Amino acid sequence: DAESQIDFINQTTNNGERTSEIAYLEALVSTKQENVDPRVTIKLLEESLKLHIAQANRLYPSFDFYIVLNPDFLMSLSQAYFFQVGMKEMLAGKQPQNGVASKGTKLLDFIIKKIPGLIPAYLLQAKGKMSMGNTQEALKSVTKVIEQDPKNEEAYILSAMIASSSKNFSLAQNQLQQALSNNFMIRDNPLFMLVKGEVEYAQGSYQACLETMKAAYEIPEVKDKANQSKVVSAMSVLQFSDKDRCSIFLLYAKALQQNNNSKEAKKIMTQAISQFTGTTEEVNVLIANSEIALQSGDVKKAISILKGVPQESPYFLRARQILADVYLDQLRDRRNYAKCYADLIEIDPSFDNYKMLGDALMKIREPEEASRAYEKAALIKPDDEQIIQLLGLSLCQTHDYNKALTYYENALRMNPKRLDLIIDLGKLCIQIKNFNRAEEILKPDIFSDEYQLPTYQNLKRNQEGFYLIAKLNIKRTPPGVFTPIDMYRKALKKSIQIQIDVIEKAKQEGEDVEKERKTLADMYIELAKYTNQYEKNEKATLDILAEASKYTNNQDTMSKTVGNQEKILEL
């Protein structure tokens, strides 16, 4: 009815002004249909937000302008944005590729900047921040809510989710204990008990989880279908959807399975299969059926279920992958492990089937068949530089250096603007012990690419080229010479400077760098050993080792990495 009325309004307003509310209504309608591409909802929401902000920005913010801005409307826009993110994708910290969660969180950030007293805005902000993987920012938003409202039950519950996702079970337990004494009625709220059961299961308290989810099984689940089809109730940031009900069912069956109650797990799960059939939850519960049937030792039914998935199902690839993962570990055979991707190929060729076949063959270390699959893919895909580098790596790893060298020379001849190709050719050429050609290829290309300095990956390639140049320089040193090769030293300082620069580049981009920190510390160690071997410059060696020690003492490298400090202290 709403869609029909929207169509009537659009037809009658063929020259009427496009408003924010009409676009928001269209976005909600598009959200409520299963067959509409999410990008349409995204663009409708963006248009509505743009029109609303354009209406607001002509003006200065008094009371009328907190009326026009309508923070409730922007909060509803952010909720509509977040609706496109699934709860499991929500918790995993994997933002959807379309970036809807970031847009919603940014809108909430603007709302909070304008109105820092909006507790639901902070709750939604912490929610979205947990969606994008920013657990610390979600925690700080929850702390803001708690300091503003110490009675806020949802705040403590959200702190519980964030602590549990960060494996801080004690903090989650404290938050849950606060939430228990906060209110007694929310012990009837399905979301809260789903949370409590999830946390108890994560902590290993299977009996408490079973009791909590039994009490979370005598609430309205069978009534949840009509409630969700007819959502009329005072709801908020925390909304009980059918996905949460499916999670309750699946984890109840799981907790029954761990308590050796296989029959009750099976009966609950058969109930769950026929309770969610028709949407994506049907294939989801089928996958769960394969999983728990595997956990019950009945592998044949699980294999039949994973194989019965047709070729028109989008989850067919995932089903085949999980079938292969359980086939290689339990049955311990690589034959059908490779067959489980081969069949994906001959059933229907595509633009990526050969790619994951080659990936599987690398995982099983069968270089020749993977190289054949990759050259088939390169036949299918015209340029596909990723397949070019994969073919190069496969031909380098097949212990047939002649054809790999020929392929590298040819690929350089077509496109001399592939830095990774030059690096791979240099590595292969130093592997084959041909120093002259290797350096004659390395030096011009490495000395020529100094125009794209602001780029991060290009700086990484420059650092790798300088490091390989230094390695080639130190390789061609006859034994017995005790003269300090200064040009290797200069290349080494250039390499460490570029490494520091790219580590900072990873910092402003919010990417894990401790691998780069540890490789730079390793390189400092190598430089210290080199400078010690020839000249007894004890003061400089001590200073360099000290800066290497204090440089690797960042983040959580105290307990994880121990060999680096071991070699440092040996030196």
Binding site: H399, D400, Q431
Partner: protein, 132 residues
């Protein structure tokens, strides 16, 4: 050298290895495969007996790809069973080739050392096959 290359690729990283051991491993690999390129030694491609496919399988290969019919071992010498002549005892039930036993003059089973005359086992297995 195909099997050598496969084994060397396997050996580079099994589950864990120190840097020096891995290093000497690729040093050996590079020396072997840079002295001369891997050349496949020709042999006899005997007709397959596992299935009706006309695609012959290499003598060394026991995988029997694209057919799924793996070949039973011969405890006597290790050659795969590519002939009608195969027999086993009632203690270990491993297929024995008559020619290998005749060449080696084995009075007992190679695995379980069953001390009963082998010609009678051959006759008994022939009778059992006739029953099948």
């Amino acid at each position: 050298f195909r099997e050598c290359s496969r084994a060397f690729v396997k050996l580079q990283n099994l589950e864990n290895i120190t840097e020096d051991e891995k290093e000497r491993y690729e040093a050996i690999a590079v020396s072997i495969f840079t002295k001369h390129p891997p050349l496949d030694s020709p042999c006899e491609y005997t007709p397959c007996v596992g299935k009706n496919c006309s695609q012959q399988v290499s003598e060394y290969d026991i995988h029997c790809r694209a057919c799924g019919s793996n070949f039973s071992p011969c405890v006597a010498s290790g050659r795969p069973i590519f002939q009608k002549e195969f027999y086993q005892c009632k203690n270990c039930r491993h297929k024995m080739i008559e020619s290998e036993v005749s060449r080696l003059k084995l009075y007992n089973c190679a695995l379980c050392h069953s001390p009963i005359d082998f010609k009678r086992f051959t006759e008994s297995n022939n009778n059992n096959n006739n029953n099948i």
